[PDB]
Structures are given as structure tokens and as C-alpha cells.
Design an enzyme around this catalytic site. Structure first.
Site, short mmCIF file in Angstrom:
data_model
loop_
_atom_site.label_atom_id
_atom_site.label_comp_id
_atom_site.label_asym_id
_atom_site.label_seq_id
_atom_site.Cartn_x
_atom_site.Cartn_y
_atom_site.Cartn_z
N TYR A 363 -4.21 -46.41 -29.64
CA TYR A 363 -2.89 -46.92 -29.98
C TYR A 363 -2.91 -48.33 -30.54
CZ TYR A 363 -0.76 -42.74 -28.24
OH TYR A 363 -0.36 -41.42 -28.09
N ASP A 377 -9.84 -37.34 -25.14
CA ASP A 377 -9.44 -36.11 -24.48
C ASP A 377 -10.60 -35.24 -23.97
OD1 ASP A 377 -6.40 -36.22 -24.66
OD2 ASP A 377 -6.94 -36.32 -26.83
N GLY A 458 -2.29 -34.15 -21.36
CA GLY A 458 -1.05 -34.88 -21.19
C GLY A 458 -0.01 -34.47 -22.20
N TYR A 460 -0.33 -34.38 -25.91
CA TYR A 460 -0.79 -33.50 -26.94
C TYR A 460 -2.00 -32.83 -26.39
N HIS A 518 -0.45 -44.93 -33.93
CA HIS A 518 -1.77 -44.65 -33.39
C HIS A 518 -2.55 -43.81 -34.36
CE1 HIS A 518 0.83 -41.27 -32.56
NE2 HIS A 518 -0.23 -40.51 -32.35
N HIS A 520 -5.37 -40.32 -34.82
CA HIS A 520 -5.97 -39.13 -34.30
C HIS A 520 -7.34 -39.04 -34.93
CE1 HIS A 520 -2.56 -37.47 -32.15
NE2 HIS A 520 -1.78 -37.74 -33.17
N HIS A 683 -1.02 -42.10 -37.62
CA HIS A 683 0.28 -41.52 -37.34
C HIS A 683 1.34 -42.62 -37.20
CE1 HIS A 683 2.85 -38.39 -34.86
NE2 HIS A 683 3.56 -39.06 -35.75
CU LIG Z 1 0.02 -38.65 -33.44
XE LIG Z 2 -3.09 -37.62 -19.53
#
Ligand SMILES: [Cu+2]
Ligand SMILES: [Xe]
Ligand SMILES: [Ca+2]
Ligand SMILES: [Ca+2]
Ligand SMILES: [Ca+2]
Ligand SMILES: [Ca+2]
Ligand SMILES: [Cu+2]
Ligand SMILES: [Xe]
Ligand SMILES: [Xe]
Ligand SMILES: [Xe]
Ligand SMILES: [Xe]
Ligand SMILES: [Xe]
Ligand SMILES: [Xe]
Ligand SMILES: [Xe]
Ligand SMILES: [Xe]
Ligand SMILES: [Xe]
Ligand SMILES: [Xe]
EC number: 1.4.3.21
Lengths: 718, 720
Positions: A363, A377, A458, A460, A518, A520, A683
Site C-alpha cells: 500500500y 498472500d 482477507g 481479496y 496500492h 497487485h 490500483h
Molecule cells: Cu487492488
Molecule cells: Xe487478512
């Protein structure tokens, strides 16, 4: 005798009644069944089948024999699934193998009592042996082995167990490694918050009467060299919180500028950071449709009434000229292995192993609840573990086949994920076409085979498609949806006074809601073996050159061609105007060109592209995760280099991923190469993405380049 | 009564499935999904029963139907896909009658000569304001239907305008210094001229070809080279490349290299024969049609919509979920999407007044005599609408498509119905959105897209254009390229031959003796976007990494540099896919106070390497003449006459009469009626996988609503 509609829906089939034809159509996975009430036979995938007991209509209600499902769906006339008589050596650990491996480590005296598991996975037998299984059917002569990685409190331990001989082969503590987050960490965190009067205090200040309505979400804290005032050696998580207002959407109700640091070994809050009070947005913002009505749409169906063109044999898939193995990992999800293309009788190697390497969503906001926020992730949460079962007909088209997969949970118990992966064939426009003037047309349809997997961490949801084209191309697509991580702000519109500061790091997407900017960033590990392991990396840069051949043109289009001989040079940005090939210098097509694959880490996207990491080079995140800032990497094959962010990225102090794997700058000349593609989006939010974000896609591509002698889909010569 | 079912229905274009077990026929065509049992007095059409007079009859398992079966079933009215138009839309194309009438008016002039040919006969569009008021407020249009008639009189262009309501010739203008496009008869002429040339027959004998009657010509335009090509500037000239017919159906695979004839069309004569070194003609049979291949066994797949379509086509107007728009066909650029609105909770909001292909160019990178001038301006020089390729049902478009016929004038002025000119189909495109909250029930909806597809073939490339309406407000435009490569004949058989290095300086060796010359595909789209109104501004948002000035441990933050782009010259730019470019409405805001916008993404991806600009040095004539090639994005002030990025008359043009011209005055783009032009393309370096026939490659562009709505547009109607 048993009620048909109910039994079939319980079994997962779709039941359609056609009153004009007096005909049931029953659809499930590869099975397309037709049956008339009272008939002695049925049709499965175009083939007749004798019934013991006809379907009987009693009172506008269908009844079937209690044995009908076994007789019809497991009859053998559905060929989609075949028995595997000899197991592929890359097959994932089975439920029994998982249980065996847990008993083997639990039998050690060094196994402490609240010990949890971060991974239980196949220890891969050696590459050469696995290729000879696939290409020559030579049995692999090693026993099955498992990597068992345990988290003892905050301590990581790596074991290896032999499953044939039922013994423990090694047990190595890993000092300095922090463990990934485990499921039980989520509840701990939420209880620790529920049981702190200090936290309840802090929340009361922020306007919240009822502290029992507070939803926590746990975050890894990264590394900042002490500058965040967190000591390196504790098991820490940071905790952001939201208010449950009963709309099913806690995400829409952030409690801004309030962060708790939790030590999971003490099970207590060890720090509370508080910033300006920002009132919590309260308007209900459901995404589940409870407040909505959809328009009525007419039905659309994709049907394959004679069955599929692919065959699944255990975990092996056969489709047209392709064969490959599909297995599932708790950290990175699906892995595609021993992929070959059948060129007129001969299987030619394409890719030994391909899978997600890792990903990160960092972020852009320096404030108290944001500055450290970077979802890794797969690395930090385990995307396999968090697989989302595919919603039939919505997440995947209605002609899909859905596979269940098994992996271990954090307590060592096998966990079956239903509908973990979807496989489906799709029409994709014409494969080629020529309409010569005043001649009969030539057209053929394009078919793609898609392997689709979804993971939710969480807020996404990520979708990955591995796409095999009949012509040899392989695509890898990454889609993102879910709920934005949002900042609570005082501004309701862009006309309010705080609007401009409020949006310094993101768009105003709802009243009091800012969508923080942020990125990806997805990284794919592709151990390509282009018609053999020994490969080289070739660059082809199209250039404009002065015409030297005469006549009126001043310039020409030429190609600058050169080899990239080592790892540092192979670590590069990608210019979508250039061509990057992994060639086999030992093998040529009919015209004498090295058989090659073209690598395209950016073949497009629906969001703006990352050119690299949106961070100054002096940021710790930039230093820990080199993989973020180049699109292409090529390293020498090594069974243990698997993750672009390193094996233990939680609170890591330096790069143990692709920055390490390339450190010694080794030769890439005619040798076993592994390609890593990093592709990203930037994004910037918009109101169209709130309260739920319509799926956005990035695309990558691997195209055969003089691998064949001609149009691969032309078909075999008579 | 009777008539044989299978044969009649297949003639008619319907798909026919017989189900022996269910004793049922399923007949499918466009928006009609029909079930019928032999002997049944009724049938089902899109879920509705229909009475038959004559049942389907089975005799010795041949099926028989009444000779009125087709009209009774497919014209029943239970297929609701097509509705008749109440009030004709003012943008409807000329009808066959109107075309015939417009031709009579100009033929009734003293100046009309019988050799005259027609390059364009098209609706001259009424003014934008009256067209919008018709679409939005139902106000009738009081100007009379007029047609542009564009004629080629030998080498001269004349532009006539005719009034069709009043039946008269409103005007008649010779356009000095304009060359006309290649016309269909030019193909025949050029082939006959060569077949009549004794000198050409000799040139061809030199290169091994004893039988001159087996040579196939193809006409190219010549371009402009300040005289260095040695060609009269005023004359109507074309260049002729040649191929040997060897009977494999693929003459493109057999170039007679270094042989160019120049042909004067007026004179019907070869005026010049450029020869270079002799290269033996590649002779091996290379059919692309499968005459020599085994048909592979593939299981069937059907996409079925058994209760009919979600869309309605009312005349040329298409209604689908929240979109409405109008579709017509032009002989130069093909399809045009017009008066495009999105229905937001009852209010139709403007998105796009007119969208269509602007123009395209395929320039080659080889300086030799058969190559150096070669650059297909496929629409401008040939008329891509004219060359529309009828969709092959089930293959060129999915089996659930509806295929539309279209009518345009041909070059002699006679109406030409093109069958299966455009395909419309709805398709599944993954999940629209999804969220699986830990421990809760799942949320997922399917994404649906509406595709309008058109295919055009010019010589050897077949082009496929998709206009794609997403339910959530996004509009996509995809261009696909397939067909047969333009190849150079060369002496090298493999890369081991002594001539290989030179033979492949400008292309890849893709077969024995065959080089795929490197080139580019460059597409340009003219999009008169009216974002919720005509008065729009252009905005840049460049994501940037800025020093952290807010304390805490971070050294950097992610921020956005936002600014307006006030004039045309500034708006003509390269596109950096890492930045954001918006056409905003500064007069209208969403509930958050953000100006309602569309994000313009001229490069959203592609299957071939991307063209960063024209792959030409700044001093090339093609470069000078065609500015549109070097910038991905242009924004100009609305002007009804500015329609072609390459200029209205690009054949042998000496300067830029298109986007270079339209932007040369650097006019204001501040809160005014803007038109957006997207240039996008590929650099094509060939490979063996693309020979003898090239698998379809795609480029993608996108227009995405940006704060145009207040929330996720696909959430559904609010009950609360
Ligand atoms: Cu995004
Ligand atoms: Xe998370
Ligand atoms: Ca290495
Ligand atoms: Ca390799
Ligand atoms: Ca406009
Ligand atoms: Ca202008
Ligand atoms: Cu091309
Ligand atoms: Xe987790
Ligand atoms: Xe396999
Ligand atoms: Xe999934
Ligand atoms: Xe080039
Ligand atoms: Xe590379
Ligand atoms: Xe590569
Ligand atoms: Xe033409
Ligand atoms: Xe319309
Ligand atoms: Xe042509
Ligand atoms: Xe622009």
C-alpha cells in the site's frame, strides 16, 4: 426407491425436465445424461445404458431406484475420469500419507505439545527420474517423502519423513525464521482484543459504545530495522479493526488510526498506536444482494452432450496434444507439472513445473494503519489453505468439471477442499481464417482448456487461470475481485475541507471512504524445459535501421539478436516491444531455427500496469522483495529455490528469494533454466469498485517460437 | 406438398440435430431455438408452444416437412429477437431504394460519364444535436435525408450531394489532386493487362515460368516518394506483385520475387516493369485448407439460449440490459456504433455519439523493389466494408450468435446485400465479482458481455473487430489478425545456407525459400465519446512515488499527479499504460463530488509484441504522410467532416490530410465536444507457427467508467 430431484441435487447434479419431450436431462461434471420416465434405457454421454429400474413418475414427482446414481453416473460410460494404475510421482500427499507423516513426527520426543504445522508436502523426487516416468514410464525408485514444517510456539522446525519405511530422516530447527500466519492466529487475535480493557478504552474514545462488535483483522508487521519500535524476535502481528453494523460488510466500517500490536506468544496486546479520531462510517453497505433484486435474465447453457475432449487419470490430464499433471500445494495452490506437447507421435517437453511463485499487495499510505501493510498472500497466509470452493456456473462456466483436492490443515489433519479447481474447455473465436476472394472460406474454431483456481485472503479474492491453447501457446491469467481495503476519512465529498488531504493517497469512493492506492504484484515460477533441459536465453529487439540496400526507403525494420548469458543480466524490466526467448541451442526446426518459447510477462491487463515497485529504493519492502521490481528473471534450476519472496518472508531482514537466487550471477548458457515472470497492476480506486470490486485481469503468455515446423493446428498429413 | 426437412433447413442456414432416443429434432437459427417431435401437432419455439398445420413426417427415417414449415416456425413471432421499427432512426444507412435513387439523380446530370465508378454512396448524417434529441427525447428530425455520392471519373474524384426527400442534386464538386481508392474491377483489369502483356510474359519466362497464364496478380497502391520511385504524380497508377498458381489453392505461398509491373488504369497499359535479380519460385504445394490433412475427431460443444436472447434488435437499434445503441454499416470503415446510452435507474446517460474504425495501416520493413513502397491502407485504399467476409456460423462466431445481413452500394452503384456481415452474441466472461468471506456464504455473479463482431479480408489479411459491451459500463474494442503472410521468395532453404544471413535481414525464414517479412499492424479508432453530455475535458492522472512528508518509518508514498490537457497538440501523445487518461465531464459529478469520467486505455494488451510508434525513421514519406501511426492517443474538437485518421484521400497523398491536419491548429479542448482517436498495434516478426496460415492474434483496448457511477454498477436494483 428414492425421490429423484432431491437425491440428484444432494449429489450435485443439475436436473432439467422438458415437458414437451417428457425427458429429463441430468448434468454433472463430465456426465450428460438423458432419461425418459418409464424407459428401460438411458443415454450417458451419447451412449445407451440398460436400467435395472426405470424412472417412475408418481404424482408429477420423479422416483428412482436407490442405486440409480451408482448405476448411471459411475457406470463407465462417462470417460472423463480413468483409473490411475501407476501413480505419478508428483501426486500430492494423500490423506493417509498426511496422517502417517504427522504420526511419524509426533513420535519424536522433541515434538512439543502445542506444535502446529505450516506445511506438509511431497518432497519432490529428482527431476530426471520424474521426466523418465512421464516420457518413458520408467518407475521412480525412491520412497515417497514428506517435508513437514512445524511451528513450535514461535519456533520453526524442518523435518523430512520417509513414508514407505515409516521413518524420520531429519529434524532441523531454523533459528531466525518467523512462521507464516496460521488459522488459529485469527481467533487468538480476536479474543485478545475482546479481553483487553485497554483496547475497549481506546475504542470507546472513538465513538464505539459496544466493544463486542469490533472485528479484527491480523497483519504481518514487516521489518523496519527497529524504526517501528518492534523488537525483531517476538512473534508479532498488527491488528486493524472495523465495526460490525450488521450489513455483512465489516470492511466498509473502518476504525481509522487505531492499531494494536499483538504478541502471540504472550497472548497479549503489547502496544496501542492511536492517531486522530476519525468517526466510523456507519451507513449499511452490503455486497451480498440482501438489499437488491437482479433483473430476470434468460438462461444460457454450455453443453457437451457426448462428454469431454479431456481425460483425467488420477491427477494427470490429457487433452488434444497436451499432457500434464495437476497437484495442489497449501502455500501456492495448484502446480502444473511434466507438461508435454505431442508433436505427431512424439511427446516434446515444454515445462517441468509451473506454479504461482508468490504475490504481494503493498500500500501507498504512510499513516499509522497503513505504512507497514503489505499482504504476502501465499507467503504469509497460504493461498492453498485459503482456497475458495468454486461456485458452479458462476466462478466457472456451466460446462466445467470441478475437482476436489486435499491438503493438511495447521493441526495436521487432512482437509478436503470441494470444488478446489475447475477444468473446462472453451470456444475462443476462430483459430485461423482465410477468406480468399471468390473462393470457399477457410475457418476453424479455437479451443482453450482452462485450469482455474480461486484463493481468498482477507478482503481479496484472486482468480488464476492456466490456459492451454491447441496451438502450443500457454496463457496464465490473474484476476482480482473482493472488497477494497479502505481508509475512514472526514470528507463526504470532494467539496469538503479535508477532501484534498484525505485523498492524497487514494480516491474518495464513498462518503468517508477512501480507497487507498496500492499495487497487485504476482510472480509465476516456470521451470520451462524447451524440448529438453539445456536452454539459453535469447533477446530479439526490433530496431529501425538506416537503409543500406538502396532505393527510396531511408529505413528498415531489423532485429537486434543477442544471448543473455548469466543471471544478473537476465533479471530485467520487460519492454512489451521486444521479444525474449528461452531457446534450445541443441535442437532446430526444419528451417534450422533453434526451437524456442517466447516469454511475455505482460500481455495486457484491465488496470494500469506497474512498471516496477512504487517505492523508493531505500524502503525496507523494496530491499526485502527484489522480485517486485523486474518483470523477468532467469536462474539455474535448483529444487529448493521456489519462492520469489524467500522461504520465510515473515519479518525477514533481507531478500532470501529471487535476490538471493541470482546473487552469484551464474551462467545461463545452454543449461537448465527457470523463468520467473513478475507482473503487476497499479490500483487507483473508483466508485465503480465499491462496495464490491468487479473482477480485473492481467495476462501473460508463453508462445511457441519455431518450436514447430508449421501451423500446429493444421492437423496431421494424410 | 412436402419437402425434405434436413436439406431444406440446412439450405436455410439452420442447425439440425436429431435425437434418436427422445424422438426429437432441435433446430437452431439466430434467436430461434425450436423443438419438434415427428407426428406432433405442436412445436416449441423459445419455450412457447406453436401449432403446426402439417406435422413433421417420418418416412423410412427420412424426415419431411410442409413447404411452409420454415415460415410458420421461424417467422412465427414467438422469436422476439427482431422487432419492427416504429420511427426510422435518422442514422439508418441508405436502403437499397435510397441507393438506387441517389444513383439516378447523379446519372441525370449532363456531367455524368458512363465510365464513372462509385467509391462511396453513404448517408450524409444530420447534425449531431438533432440525432441526440431523436434518441433521447424522441423529437423528429426535420432536415431531409441526404446522401454523399463519391465518384471516380477515370482519375478524378467528384463529390456529389443528393437530397432524397426532395429528389434533387444539391451539389457537384471535382476535387483536384485527389486520387480514388482501389475498386473491385481494378483487380480484374490488372490481371487482364498482365495477361495481355508480351513483355511481362517475357519477364516471367526469365524466372522459370514457361506458362504465363498461371500467374496471379495483386494490385497495391504506390504511395509517394517525392519522385524517387520514377512515377508520374498525376496518373492513376497501381503496382502489381505476382505469384505462381501451382494448384494448391495458396498462390500466396509462391512469390515471383523482384518483379514489379506498374499499370496505368486509364490507358489500360503496363507503363513500367521493375526487375531485379532472379530468385527461383518456391514450388512445393502448401495448401492451408486441409485438402491434405486428417480431420481430427472433436466432441461437440453447444452454447444454447433456449428461451431466446436478452437483446432485442428493433430495426438497426440494439437494446441489451442497460445499453442502447444503433448499428450501421459503411463501405469504407464497416460498422458504426452510434447514440450509445447507458440506462442508469431510468435515466439514459450519454456515452458515445459515434464509434468506428478510423483507418488502418500495415507497413513493411523491407527496402527491396517488391517491398519498399508496400503499406496496405486497408480501409482508405480498398474499402473494408466492401470487403466484409460473411461470418462462418459456429466458427467465426459462437453457436449462440445472431448474424445480420447488411446492404451497401457496390462500385457500379448497385445495392449489394452482404450475408452474415455482422454477428451479435452474448457471452459468459467469468465472474463479474466475487467475495468469499471466511466462514460465510459465498457471493458471486456471472459476467456477461455483448459482442458485435465484424470481419474484413483485404488480399492476404483477414481482420476481426469486436465491440464489446460489458454489463458494468466498460466498452472493449479488440482487433484480431489472421490469414496468410506476405512472404518474400529467397534462396536459403535453411538457416545453414550461405545466403541465410542476408535473406533474413528483414524477416524470419518460416519455410524452405520463404521469408515472412517483418511489418506492423496499426489500427486507429475514432470515438466520439460524449461523457454524459458533449462538453468534456481531458484529464491526466500519473501515479508517482513521492517522498513521505508525514513521518513514520516510510521513505515514500504513492500519490497521483493530476492535470488538465488543454489543447489538441498536447492531447496527441504516446500512451504509457502505467498512467490514466480520462475524458471527464467537468459539468457533472457523482455522489462523491468527482466529475463523471471514462478512462481511455488504447493499449490493454496484445498477443504479438506492441508497436511503440511507427517503425520508420522520421524522414520517411509514409511517416510524413501518416502522423496517426506515431501517437497512441489524439483528442480533437468535434467536426462532422473529420472521420479518417489517414485523411479522406490517402492514395498517393503528399502530406497529412488526417489527424496531422485535424490537430494542426492546436485548438482548445477545455470543456468542449471532444473526439478521441486510439491508435494501437503490433510489430510482427514471423515464426514457422504462422505458416501456411496464421493463427489469430489479438490486440485489446478498453473504455472504463471512472466515477461515472456512484457504486458497483452491477449490484442490482435497490429494494431499500
Ligand atoms: Cu487492488
Ligand atoms: Xe487478512
Ligand atoms: Ca542461482
Ligand atoms: Ca528448465
Ligand atoms: Ca464528443
Ligand atoms: Ca481540430
Ligand atoms: Cu502480421
Ligand atoms: Xe491463515
Ligand atoms: Xe502427465
Ligand atoms: Xe477455487
Ligand atoms: Xe522494427
Ligand atoms: Xe530475460
Ligand atoms: Xe525468458
Ligand atoms: Xe476493392
Ligand atoms: Xe439507439
Ligand atoms: Xe490487395
Ligand atoms: Xe490524451
Amino acid at each position: 426407491m428414492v425421490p429423484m430431484d432431491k437425491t440428484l441435487k444432494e449429489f450435485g447434479a443439475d436436473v432439467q425436465w422438458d415437458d414437451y419431450a417428457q425427458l429429463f436431462t441430468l448434468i454433472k461434471d463430465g456426465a450428460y445424461v438423458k432419461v425418459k420416465p418409464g424407459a428401460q434405457t438411458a443415454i450417458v454421454n451419447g451412449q445407451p445404458l440398460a436400467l435395472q429400474v426405470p424412472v417412475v413418475m408418481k404424482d408429477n414427482k420423479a422416483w428412482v431406484s436407490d442405486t440409480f446414481i451408482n448405476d448411471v453416473f459411475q457406470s463407465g460410460l462417462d470417460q472423463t475420469f480413468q483409473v490411475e494404475k501407476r501413480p505419478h510421482p508428483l501426486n500430492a500427499l494423500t490423506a493417509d500419507e498426511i496422517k502417517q507423516a504427522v504420526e511419524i513426527v509426533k513420535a519424536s520426543a522433541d515434538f512439543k505439545p502445542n506444535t502446529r504445522f505450516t506445511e506438509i508436502s511431497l518432497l519432490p523426487p529428482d527431476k530426471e527420474a520424474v521426466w523418465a516416468f512421464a516420457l518413458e514410464n520408467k518407475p521412480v525408485d525412491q520412497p515417497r517423502k514428506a517435508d513437514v514444517i512445524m511451528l513450535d510456539g514461535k519456533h520453526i522446525i524442518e523435518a523430512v519423513v520417509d513414508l514407505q519405511n515409516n521413518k524420520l530422516l531429519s529434524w532441523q530447527p531454523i533459528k531466525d525464521a518467523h512462521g507464516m500466519v496460521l488459522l488459529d492466529d485469527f481467533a487468538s487475535v480476536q479474543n485478545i482484543i475482546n479481553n483487553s480493557e485497554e483496547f475497549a478504552a481506546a475504542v470507546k474514545k472513538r465513538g464505539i459504545t459496544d466493544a463486542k462488535k469490533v472485528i479484527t483483522t491480523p497483519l504481518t508487521v514487516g521489518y523496519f530495522d527497529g524504526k517501528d519500535g518492534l523488537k525483531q524476535d517476538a512473534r508479532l502481528l498488527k491488528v486493524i479493526s472495523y465495526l460490525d453494523v450488521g450489513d455483512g460488510n465489516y470492511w466498509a466500517h473502518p476504525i481509522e488510526n487505531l492499531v494494536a500490536v499483538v504478541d502471540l506468544e504472550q497472548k497479549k496486546i503489547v502496544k496501542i498506536e492511536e492517531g486522530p479520531v476519525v468517526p466510523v462510517p456507519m451507513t449499511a453497505r452490503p455486497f451480498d444482494g440482501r438489499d437488491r433484486v437482479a433483473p430476470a435474465v434468460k438462461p444460457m447453457q454450455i453443453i457437451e452432450p457426448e462428454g469431454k475432449n479431456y481425460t483425467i487419470t488420477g491427477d494427470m490430464i490429457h487433452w488434444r496434444n497436451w499432457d500434464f499433471h495437476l497437484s495442489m500445494n497449501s502455500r501456492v495452490g495448484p502446480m502444473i507439472s511434466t507438461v508435454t506437447y505431442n508433436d505427431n507421435g512424439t511427446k516434446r517437453k515444454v515445462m517441468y513445473e509451473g506454479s504461482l511463485g508468490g504475490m504481494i499487495v503493498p500500500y501507498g499510505d504512510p499513516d499509522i494503519g497503513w505504512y507497514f501493510k503489505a499482504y504476502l498472500d501465499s507467503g504469509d497466509y497460504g493461498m492453498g489453505t485459503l482456497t475458495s470452493p468454486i461456485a458452479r456456473g458462476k466462478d466457472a462456466p456451466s460446462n466445467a468439471v470441478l475437482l476436489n483436492e486435499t491438503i493438511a490443515d495447521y493441526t495436521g489433519v487432512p482437509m478436503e477442499i470441494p470444488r478446489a479447481i475447475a477444468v473446462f474447455e472453451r470456444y475462443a473465436g476462430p483459430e485461423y481464417k482465410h477468406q480468399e476472394m471468390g473462393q470457399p472460406n477457410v475457418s476453424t474454431e479455437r479451443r482453450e482448456l482452462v485450469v482455474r483456481w480461486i484463493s481468498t485472503v482477507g478482503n481479496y479474492d484472486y482468480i488464476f487461470d492456466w490456459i492451454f491453447h491447441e496451438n502450443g501457446t500457454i496463457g496464465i491469467d490473474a484476476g482480482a475481485t473482493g472488497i477494497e481495503a479502505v481508509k475512514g476519512v472526514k470528507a463526504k465529498t470532494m467539496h469538503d475541507e479535508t477532501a484534498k488531504d484525505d485523498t492524497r493517497y487514494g480516491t474518495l469512493i464513498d462518503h468517508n471512504i477512501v480507497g487507498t492506492t496500492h499495487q497487485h504484484i504476482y510472480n509465476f515460477r516456470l521451470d520451462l524445459d524447451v524440448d529438453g533441459e539445456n536452454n539459453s536465453l535469447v533477446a530479439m529487439d526490433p530496431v529501425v535501421k538506416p537503409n543500406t540496400a538502396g532505393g527510396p526507403r531511408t529505413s528498415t525494420m531489423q532485429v537486434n539478436q543477442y544471448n543473455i548469458g548469466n543471471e544478473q543480466d537476465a533479471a530485467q524490466k520487460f519492454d512489451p516491444g521486444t521479444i525474449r526467448l528461452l531457446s534450445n541451442p541443441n535442437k532446430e526446426n526444419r528451417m534450422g531455427n533453434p526451437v524456442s518459447y517466447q516469454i511475455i510477462p505482460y500481455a495486457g491487463g484491465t488496470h494500469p500496469v506497474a512498471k516496477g515497485a512504487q517505492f523508493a529504493p531505500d524502503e525496507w519492502i523494496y530491499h526485502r522483495l527484489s522480485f517486485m521490481d523486474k518483470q523477468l528473471w532467469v536462474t539455474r534450476y535448483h529444487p529448493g529455490e521456489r519462492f520469489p519472496e524467500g522461504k520465510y518472508p515473515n519479518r525477514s531482514t533481507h531478500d532470501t528469494g529471487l535476490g538471493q537466487y541470482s546473487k552469484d550471477n551464474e551462467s545461463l548458457d545452454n543449461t537448465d533454466a527457470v523463468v520467473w515472470m513478475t507482473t503487476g497492476t497499479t490500483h487507483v480506486a473508483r466508485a465503480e469498485e465499491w462496495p464490491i470490486m468487479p473482477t480485473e485481469w492481467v495476462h501473460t503468455l508463453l508462445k511457441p517460437w519455431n518450436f514447430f515446423d508449421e501451423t500446429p493446428t493444421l492437423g496431421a498429413l494424410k
